[PDB]
Ligand code: BCL
Ligand code: BCL
Ligand code: BCL
Ligand code: BCL
Ligand SMILES: CC[C@H]1c2cc3[nH]c4c(c3C)C(=O)[C@H](C(=O)OC)c4c3nc(cc4[nH]c(cc(n2)[C@@H]1C)c(C(C)=O)c4C)[C@@H](C)[C@@H]3CCC(=O)OC/C=C(/C)CCC[C@H](C)CCC[C@@H](C)CCCC(C)C
Ligand SMILES: CC[C@H]1c2cc3[nH]c4c(c3C)C(=O)[C@H](C(=O)OC)c4c3nc(cc4[nH]c(cc(n2)[C@@H]1C)c(C(C)=O)c4C)[C@@H](C)[C@@H]3CCC(=O)OC/C=C(\C)CCC[C@H](C)CCC[C@@H](C)CCCC(C)C
Ligand SMILES: COC1=C(OC)C(=O)C(C/C=C(\C)CC/C=C(/C)CC/C=C(\C)CC/C=C(/C)CC/C=C(\C)CC/C=C(/C)CC/C=C(/C)CC/C=C(\C)CC/C=C(\C)CCC=C(C)C)=C(C)C1=O
Ligand SMILES: COC1=C(OC)C(=O)C(C/C=C(\C)CC/C=C(\C)CC/C=C(\C)CC/C=C(\C)CC/C=C(\C)CC/C=C(\C)CC/C=C(\C)CC/C=C(\C)CC/C=C(/C)CCC=C(C)C)=C(C)C1=O
Ligand SMILES: COC(C)(C)C(=O)C/C=C(\C)CC/C=C(\C)CC/C=C(\C)CCCC/C(C)=C/CCC(C)CC/C=C(\C)CCC=C(C)C
C-alpha cells in the first residue's frame with residue numbers, strides 16, 4: 001500500500017546500477033540493485049552467525065558470540081572455527097551497510113533530494129570499520145577487533161578500556177563524549193521548541209517561528225535559527241562519531257600506556273614544571 | 281526487588297510510548313491506499329489517532345488532522361505492471377505535469393506570514409534596510425544553465441525577513457520576465473551563478489508567480505519541485521564536469 | 529551541501545514577539561556576528577532578564593567562584609600553578625563521618641556544600657525561567673518538561689542518592705579529573721555498571737540521539753531545497769518537502785513520520801537518556817550493591 005499522497009512520486013529512475021531491472025517496490029520498501037545486495041549480505045551474515053551458534057552450543061541470544069582470529073593469526077585468514085566465521089561475517093556486515101547506504105542514494109535520486117542522509121550514515125560505517133578493520137590492521141592483528149556478542153562485546157569495551165587505565169583520560173574520547181552530551185541536549189531542545197509552538201496553551205493559536213526565536217532569545221540571548229538547528233544537530237552527531245573513531249584509531253597504535261600519563265606534557269612543560277605548590 | 285520491578289515497568293512503558301508515538305505520526309498519509317486510490321485491505325497494526333485541531337494564526341482558519349482531505353488534482357502517471365509494487369511512468373512531460381521528483385503539493389495559495397502578519401518572503405528591493413552582509417553579492421551576475429549556456433541575469437535576492445536569510449534569486453530571462461530560483465539549487469561563483477538542475481532551455485518553464493511582489497506557498501512548491509525535478513529529467517542536457525572546467 | 533550559507537543577508541534588528549512579555553526586562557540587541565552568520569543567525573540578543581534570571585545568574589557565578597577560589601587556594605595563589613594544575617584541583621564533599629550535617633569545616637567539606645547550594649539555586653531558578661518565558665509567549669511547556677529530565681539525573685547524583693545513603697560524601701566532587709575518577713570508581717564499587725540494565729538503556733538512548741539527530745538533521749537539509757526547514761508551516765499545511773522526507777524513510781526502512789511527529793520521537797529519544805540514567809544511578813548502592821550479582825539472580 002501507499003501513503004495517501006505517494007503515487008505521484010513512484011516514478012521510474014534514480015538507479016545507479018542495473019537500470020530498471022530491480023527498480024520496484026515490495027510493500028513500503030523500495031528495492032533497487034542494492035536492496036538485493038543488502039538482503040544477500042544480511043542473510044549470509046545472519047546464517048553464518050547462526051552456524052557459529054551451533055558450533056558453540058547455544059541458541060541463547062545472551063550467550064551466542066562470534067570471536068575474531070586469535071592474535072596468533074595476525075592479519076591472515078583463520079579456520080572458520082577460530083576466526084574465519086568472524087572474518088566472513090565482518091565482510092557481510094560491511095557489504096550490507098555500504099549497500100544500505102548506496103540504496104539510500106538511489107532513493108534520494110528518485111525523490112530528487114540531497115544526499116545528506118547516506119553521507120551522514122557513512123560516518124557510522126566508518127566508525128564501525130575503524131573498530132574491526134582499520135585499528136586491527138594498524139596493530140597487525142584481526143584479534144584486536146571486538147567480538148560479535150550482545151554481552152561479549154561490552155567485555156571487550158571494558159577490557160580494551162582498562163588496558164590503558166581509566167579510559168576517560170583519552171583526550172579525543174573527552175571530545176567525543178562532549179559532542180554526544182551536547183547533541184542529546186540539542187535534540188531535546190529542538191524537539192521541545194517545535195512542539196511548544198505547534199501545541200501552545202489550550203485555546204490559543206499555534207505559535208509562529210518568531211515565537212520560537214523570541215522564546216530562545218529571551219531564555220539565553222540567542223537563536224540559531226531553523227536552518228541552523230538542523231545543521232547543528234547533524235554537526236554534533238557526526239562530530240561525536242568522528243572523534244569516537246579518532247580516539248580509538250590512536251589507542252594501541254601511537255599511544256600505548258595509561259592515558260592519564262599523557263596529561264604530563266602539560267604539567268611538565270619547562271617553564272612551570274618545577275614551581276612549588278598546587279597538586280604537582 | 282525494586283530493580284526487577286523497575287526494569288519490568290520500563291519495558292511496559294516503552295511499548296506503549298512507541299505505540300503512542302507511531303499513532304501520532306499517522307496524522308498525515310493515512311489511511312493507506314492501493315495504487316489506484318482505493319483504501320488498502322491491511323492498514324497495519326496501529327490505529328488512526330483521535331483527531332487534533334490546530335487553530336491557525338492570522339485568521340487563516342483551522343486544521344483538523346488526520347482528515348479526509350484527498351489528493352484531488354490530476355497526476356500524469358500510468359502503471360507499467362498489472363501487479364502492485366511497480367513504477368508508474370508519466371504520460372506527458374513530468375516537469376510540466378509536476379510528477380515524480382518534479383512533484384508539488386496544492387498548498388495554500390497565499391504567502392507565508394511572519395509572526396507580525398507580514399509576508400515572510402520579500403524581494404530585497406522592498407525589504408527595508410536589508411542588504412548583503414557577507415559573501416559574493418549575486419545581484420548583477422549572469423546565470424548559466426547545466427548545458428553551459430546563459431539562461432539570464434540575477435536582478436534581486438528574495439529574502440526571508442524573520443529568519444533574516446536569502447531564499448531565492450530573481451533571474452531575468454531573454455523575454456524580459458523573471459523567475460524565482462531556489463537558493464540551495466544555485467552555486468554563486470565570482471563571475472557567475474551556476475544552476476546545475478536546469479538547462480538554459482528549461483528556465484522559461486519554471487512556474488511563475490501571479491504577483492511580482494510576493495510568492496504564495498503554492499507557487500513556492502511548484503517552483504521548487506520543478507527545479508529539483510531537473511536533476512533527473514534534464515540529465516540528457518547536463519554537460520560533464522570536464523566540459524565545465526573547459527569553459528573557465 | 530547547505531551546511532554553510534553562500535551569501536549573508538542582514539536587516540533591522542529583530543526585537544521579537546511581545547505577547548504577555550514584560551518588554552521592560554529585555555535588553556537591547558547585541559552585535560551581529562558575521563561568523564555565526566555562516567552557520568546560523570548572525571544576531572545576538574536581546575535577552576530577557578527578570579529577577580529569576582539575575583538570581584539564577586548570580587547563584588551560577590557564585591557556584592563557579594566558590595570552586596575557583598578553592599582552586600586558587602590550593603594553587604598557592606600562584607598563576608603559573610593555577611593553570612598547570614587546573615584539571616587536578618577538586619572541591620571535595622564532606623567525609624562520611626559527617627553524614628548529612630553541615631558540621632564539616634569549610635576547608636574540608638563546607639566549601640563544597642556552599643558551592644552546591646549555589647548550584648541548586650542556579651539550576652532550579654533557571655528551570656522556572658524556562659517555564660515562564662514559554663508562558664509569557666503563550667507556548668507549551670515542553671522545554672521545561674525536557675529540562676526536568678536532565679535535572680532528574682543531576683538531582684539523583686548530588687542530592688537524592690547521597691541523602692538516601694546517609695552522607696554528602698556520596699555526591700560528586702567539583703573537578704575536571706576528579707569527577708571523572710569519581711565516575712570510574714562508581715562503576716567499580718557497584719559491580720560492573722555495564723550489568724546495570726538502566727545503564728545499558730541510557731546508552732541506547734544516547735547513541736540513539738546521535739542516530740536520530742543525524743537522520744533528522746540530514747533529512748531537513750536534504751529537503752531544504754523545498755523549504756523543508758519551515759517546519760511549523762509544513763505541519764500546518766503539508767508541502768512536497770514533508771512528503772519527500774516521509775517517503776525517503778518509508779521506502780528505506782518500511783515506515784516514516786510526520787513533520788510534527790518526528791519532533792515527538794526526538795524529544796523522547798533525548799529525554800529518556802537522563803530518565804533511565806537517573807533511575808539506574810538511584811538504584812545503585814541503595815537497592816543493588818553489585819550489578820553483576822543482581823543480573824545473576
Ligand atoms: C554522566 C556521568 C558523569 C560524568 C562523566 C563525564 C565523562 C565521562 C566526561 C565528562 C565530560 C564533561 N563533564 Mg561530566 N559527568 C557527570 C556530570 C557532569 C555535570 C553535572 C552538572 O552533573 C557537569 C557540569 C559536568 C561537566 C563536564 C564538562 C567538564 C565536560 C563536558 C560536558 C558537556 O559537553 O556537556 C554538554 C553541554 C554543553 C557543551 C553546554 C555547555 C556546558 C559547559 C561546557 C560545561 C562546563 C562546566 C564548567 C563547570 C567547567 C568548564 C571547564 C573549565 C576548565 C573550568 N559533568 C556525571 C557525574 N563527564 C567530558 C570531559 O571532557 O571531561 C573533561 C568527559 O569525557
Ligand atoms: C570501562 C570502559 C571505558 C571505555 C572504553 C571505550 C572503548 C574501548 C571504546 C569506547 C567508545 C566510546 N566511548 Mg567509552 N569508555 C568508558 C566510559 C565512557 C563514558 C562514560 C559516561 O563514562 C562515555 C559517555 C563514553 C562514550 C564513548 C563514545 C565516545 C564511544 C562510543 C560511541 C561510538 O563509538 O559510536 C560509533 C558508532 C558505531 C560503531 C555504530 C556503527 C553502526 C553500524 C555502521 C551499523 C549497524 C547496523 C545494525 C547491524 C542493524 C541491526 C538491525 C536493525 C536494527 C534492523 N565512554 C570507560 C572509561 N570507550 C568506543 C569508540 O569510541 O569507538 C569508536 C570504543 O571502542
Ligand atoms: C559504540 C562503541 C562500542 C559499543 C558499546 C556499547 C555499550 C557500552 C553498550 C552497547 C549497547 C548495545 N550495542 Mg554496542 N558497541 C559497539 C558496536 C555495536 C554495533 C556495531 C555493528 O558496531 C552494534 C550493532 C551494537 C549493538 C548494540 C545493542 C545490542 C545495544 C544497544 C545499541 C543502541 O541502542 O544504539 C542506538 C541505536 C538504536 C536505538 C537503533 C536500534 C539498534 C538495535 C537495537 C541493534 C540490535 C543489534 C542486534 C542485537 C545484533 C545484530 C543483529 C543482526 C540481525 C544479527 N553495538 C562498539 C564496539 N554497545 C548497550 C547494551 O545494552 O548492550 C548489551 C550498552 O550498554
Ligand atoms: C568506568 C566508567 C563506567 C561508567 C560509569 C557511569 C556512571 C557512574 C554514570 C554513567 C552515566 C552514563 N553513561 Mg556510563 N560508564 C561506563 C561506560 C559507558 C560507555 C562506554 C562506551 O563504555 C558509554 C557509551 C556510557 C554512556 C553513559 C551515558 C548514557 C550516561 C550519562 C548520560 C548523560 O547525558 O550524562 C550527561 C548529563 C547530565 C549529568 C545531566 C546534567 C543536568 C544539569 C542540570 C546540568 C548543570 C549544568 C551546570 C549548571 C553548568 C552550566 C554551564 C554552562 C556553560 C552554562 N557509559 C563505564 C562502565 N556511566 C550516568 C548514568 O546515567 O548512569 C546510568 C552516570 O551517572
Ligand atoms: C535530556 C537530557 C539532556 C539535557 C537537556 C536539557 N538541558 C537543558 C535544557 C534541556 C531540555 C534546558 O532547557 C536548559 C537550557 O536552558 O538550555 C539552553 C538546559 C541546560 N543544560 C545545560 C548544561 C548541561 N546539560 C547537560 C546534559 C543534558 N541536558 C542532557 C544530555 C550537560 C552535560 C554534563 O552533559 C551540561 C553541562 C545548561 C546550558 C542549561 C542550564 C543552565 C543552568 O542550569 O543555569 C546555571 C546558571 C549559571 C549562571 C552558571 C554559569 C556558569 C558559567 C561556567 C560561569 C562562567 C563565568 C566566566 C564567564 C567568568 C569567570 C572567569 C573569567 C573571569 C576568566
Ligand atoms: C554517524 C552518527 C550516528 C548514526 C547515523 C546513522 N545511522 C543510520 C543512518 C544514519 C544517518 C541511516 O540512514 C541508517 C538508517 O537507515 O536508520 C534508520 C542508520 C542505521 N543505524 C543503525 C544502527 C546503529 N547506528 C548506530 C550509531 C550511529 N548511527 C551514529 C551515532 C548504532 C550504535 C551502536 O550506536 C547502531 C546500533 C541501523 C538501525 C541503521 C542501518 C541498518 C542497516 O545497515 O541495514 C543493513 C543491514 C542489516 C538489515 C542487518 C545486517 C546484519 C549483519 C550482517 C550481522 C553482523 C552484525 C555485527 C557486525 C555485530 C552484531 C553484534 C553486536 C552486539 C555488536
Ligand atoms: C533557538 O535555537 C536553538 C536551539 O533549538 C531549540 C538549541 O537547541 C540550541 C542548543 C545548542 C547548544 C547549547 C550548542 C553548544 C554549542 C557548541 C558548538 C559546543 C560544542 C562542544 C564541544 C566541542 C565540547 C567542549 C567541551 C570540552 C570539555 C572539551 C574538552 C577537551 C579536551 C580535554 C581535550 C583538548 C585537548 C587536545 C590536545 C585535543 C586532544 C586530541 C587528540 C587527537 C590528541 C591525541 C594525542 C596523542 C596520541 C599524543 C600526542 C601526540 C602527537 C601530537 C604526535 C606524535 C608524537 C611525537 C612524540 C612526535 C541553541 C543554541 C539554539 O539557538
Ligand atoms: C521530518 O522528516 C522526517 C521524516 O518524515 C517526515 C522521517 O520519517 C524521519 C525518520 C524517522 C522516524 C520514522 C522516527 C523513528 C526512528 C528511529 C527511532 C530511528 C531508529 C530506527 C529503527 C530502530 C528502525 C530500523 C529499521 C530498519 C533498519 C529496517 C529494517 C528492515 C527490514 C525488516 C527489511 C530489510 C530490508 C532490506 C534488506 C532491503 C529491501 C528489500 C528487499 C531486499 C526484498 C528483495 C526481494 C526480492 C528481489 C524478491 C522478488 C520481488 C519482486 C517484487 C519481483 C517479482 C514480482 C512480480 C509481481 C512479477 C526523519 C528523520 C525526518 O526528519
Ligand atoms: C579564574 O579564577 C576565578 C577564581 C576568576 C574563576 O572564575 C575560576 C573558576 C573555575 C576554577 C571553576 C572550575 C569549576 C569546575 C572545573 C567545575 C566542575 C564541576 C563539575 C564537573 C560538576 C559536576 C557534577 C556536579 C553535580 C552532580 C552536582 C550536583 C549538585 C547538587 C544537586 C546540589 C545539591 C545541593 C546541596 C548538597 C546543598 C544542600 C542542600 C540543599 C537542599 C540546599
Ligand SMILES: CCCCCCCCCCCC[N+](C)(C)[O-]
Nearest residue numbers: 292294295296297298299300302
Ligand atoms: C516495533 C517494536 C516496538 C513496538 C512493539 C509494539 C508495542 C505495542 C504496545 C501496545 C500497547 C498498547 N496499550 C493500549 C496497552 O497501551
Ligand SMILES: CCCCCCCCCCCC[N+](C)(C)[O-]
Nearest residue numbers: 028298302312323324325782783
Ligand atoms: C526503536 C524504534 C522502532 C519503531 C518501530 C515502529 C514500527 C512501526 C511500523 C509501521 C508500519 C507502517 N505501515 C507500513 C503500516 O504503514
Ligand SMILES: CCCCCCCCCCCC[N+](C)(C)[O-]
Nearest residue numbers: 220221222555556557558573575
Ligand atoms: C549566548 C550569548 C548570549 C549573549 C546575550 C547578549 C545580549 C545583548 C547584549 C546586552 C545588551 C546590550 N546593550 C544594552 C548595549 O544593547
Ligand SMILES: CCCCCCCCCCCC[N+](C)(C)[O-]
Nearest residue numbers: 724725726728729732736796797
Ligand atoms: C524512542 C526509541 C526507543 C528505542 C529503544 C531501543 C532499546 C534497545 C535495546 C536496549 C537493550 C538494553 N539492556 C538493558 C537489555 O541491555
Ligand SMILES: [Fe+2]
Nearest residue numbers: 194744748759
Ligand atoms: Fe526539526
